[PDB]
Design a protein around this ligand. Structure first.
Ligand code: NA
Length: 290
């Protein structure tokens, strides 16, 4: 019998003249946003067919979330459409672990696990199922601060609604119930979290490398899972494995994963065994909008 409360988030519409594109990043540009008369320059990423409707669905979700471990939308620009978000200078975490694989220690790894779980727990409190959690969809602000991104598949659940039933989706990150029945829940995001942790702990290897996506569900039905990464103690691997239980309500909760990884991060070498272990510039996190 729980009802729904209003979503009073504010969608900010930016003027094209207020931002300057500097260089291409991927099209996504790195640039500066300079709102008129405010004496600030904010580093931004500027991401530039009627299916426009997907970028607006994405804008709607990003305007509705506010957490230090979820990506920050500054606004949209309605030219012939641009989505303006906080610049995350070190890019996506998958590429970051692959490129710095010889300089990544146990403290960094465990702290990233904590932060992603905090962001995901926040999304669960907002009743949002992300549906595309992966290392590619975590962005790096600094080595010590990461945030979840890419809300293009995300869905808001009603207050009395446990499942989203879908009508292209990344098979190797998906829970088995999502592959077989198009059912998505916060517990299916937990399966994807487990896969995401596996990508980090292997320094960015591809899951189920060389196995085609059509084979994956039958592999999982037979009881097989991703293998224990060389650096992982049984304590860390057991958490991943629990994320990949068939029974979705047997999987850990994001709030539990925060607790378990924060304990490990207090004694990181017990849990991972690793070889060799401008004046007016304001970051978006210090530019608060009513
Ligand atoms: Na060690």
């Amino acid at each position: 019998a729980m009802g729904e409360a209003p979503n009073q988030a504010l969608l900010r519409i930016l003027k094209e003249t207020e931002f300057k594109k500097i260089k291409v990043l991927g099209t996504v540009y790195k640039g500066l946003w300079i709102p008129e008369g405010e004496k600030v320059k904010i580093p931004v990423a500027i991401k530039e067919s009627p299916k426009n409707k997907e970028i607006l669905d994405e804008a709607y979700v990003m305007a509705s979330v506010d957490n230090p471990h979820v990506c920050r939308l500054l606004g949209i620009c309605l030219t012939s459409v641009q989505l303006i978000t906080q610049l995350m200078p070190f890019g996506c975490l998958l590429d970051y672990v692959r490129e710095h694989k010889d300089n990544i220690g146990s403290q960094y790894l465990l702290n990233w696990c904590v932060q992603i779980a905090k962001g995901m727990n926040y999304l669960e409190d907002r009743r949002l199922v992300h549906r595309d959690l992966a290392a590619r969809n975590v962005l790096v602000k600094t080595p010590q601060h990461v945030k979840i991104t890419d809300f293009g598949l995300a869905k808001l659940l009603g207050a009395e609604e446990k499942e989203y039933h879908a009508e292209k989706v990344p098979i190797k990150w998906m829970a088995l119930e999502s592959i077989l029945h198009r059912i998505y829940t916060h517990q299916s995001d937990v399966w994807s979290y487990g896969v995401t942790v596996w990508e980090l702990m292997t320094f960015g290897s591809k899951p189920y490398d060389g196995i085609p996506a059509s084979e994956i569900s039958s592999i999982l039905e037979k009881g097989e899972r991703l293998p224990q990464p060389p650096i992982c103690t049984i304590d860390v691997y057991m958490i991943m494995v629990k994320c990949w239980m068939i029974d979705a309500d047997s999987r850990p909760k994001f709030r539990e994963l925060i607790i378990e990884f924060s304990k490990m991060a207090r004694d990181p070498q017990r849990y991972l065994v690793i070889q060799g272990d401008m004046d007016d510039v304001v970051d978006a996190d210090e530019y608060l909008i009513p």
